[PDB]
């Protein structure tokens, strides 16, 4: 029996599949560039530990449990008292914490894990940008690669010119609209683009009281 609450066909996603794989195909990275590539590809696989409900491969039976992280996040998405960086947070603590969440939830669980490792000296992490093609979430890291933990796949973005692999790999998809991101410079930034300084200011809280001290989200290979 197929999955029934499948959000894309096995063509779809194999035809995504075969793009990204053209796309990584033609790219050579530099060392540092190499470096932060293996982090990437590490970290979509560590999203592994959160199943989705909603592509062609999942079990169908995974859509009540699911549902209960769904639950969770739209009751805390429409809170009043949380910061939009709090929220995300939370979510990628509540999917990681229960092993199951769709696009968003995974998505947010990267973000959360690539926030944390930016914490360490030196790290090569410098922005974190999600966004959505319409309900389809994504993670863009420095301006410079996409993560897709959802179908555990992610690309690299040429320079000053990265929608000529997103407008490839992601052809048909829609317009790609910004969710949340925070710069090099700890700016954080809603969606036209407004600044958070909520966000801003909880950043510290943030980090601590969701992330920290929680296996989930620290790497040790780096
Ligand atoms: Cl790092
Ligand atoms: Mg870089």
């Known amino acids: 029996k197929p999955n ?9 996603v194999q035809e995504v599949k075969a ?3 053209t796309v990584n195909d033609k790219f050579h990275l530099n060392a540092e560039e190499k470096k932060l590539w293996e982090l990437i590809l590490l970290g979509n696989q560590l999203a592994q530990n959160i199943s989705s409900c909603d592509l062609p491969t999942d079990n169908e039976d995974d859509a009540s449990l699911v549902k209960l992280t769904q639950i969770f996040a739209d009751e805390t998405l429409e809170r009043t008292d949380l910061t939009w960086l709090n929220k995300i947070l939370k979510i990628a603590l509540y999917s990681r914490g229960s092993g199951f969440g769709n696009c968003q939830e995974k998505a ?3 973000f959360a894990l690539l926030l944390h490792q930016a914490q360490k000296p030196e790290s090569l992490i410098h922005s974190l940008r999600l966004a959505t093609f319409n309900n389809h979430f994504i993670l863009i890291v ?3 690669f996409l993560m897709d933990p959802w179908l555990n796949l992610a ?3 040429s320079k000053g010119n990265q929608q000529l692999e997103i407008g490839y790999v992601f052809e048909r998809f829609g317009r790609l609209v910004n969710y949340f991101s925070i710069n090099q410079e700890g700016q954080c930034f809603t969606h036209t683009i407004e600044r958070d300084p909520s966000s801003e200011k909880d950043m510290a809280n943030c980090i601590h009281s969701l992330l920290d001290h929680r296996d989930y989200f620290d790497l040790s290979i780096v």
């Open 4 to 12: 029934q609450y499948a959000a894309l066909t096995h063509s779809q």
């Open 19 to 21: 793009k990204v794989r």
């Open 108 to 110: 947010f669980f990267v």
């Open 142 to 144: 420095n301006e410079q």
């Open 155 to 157: 690309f690299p973005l």
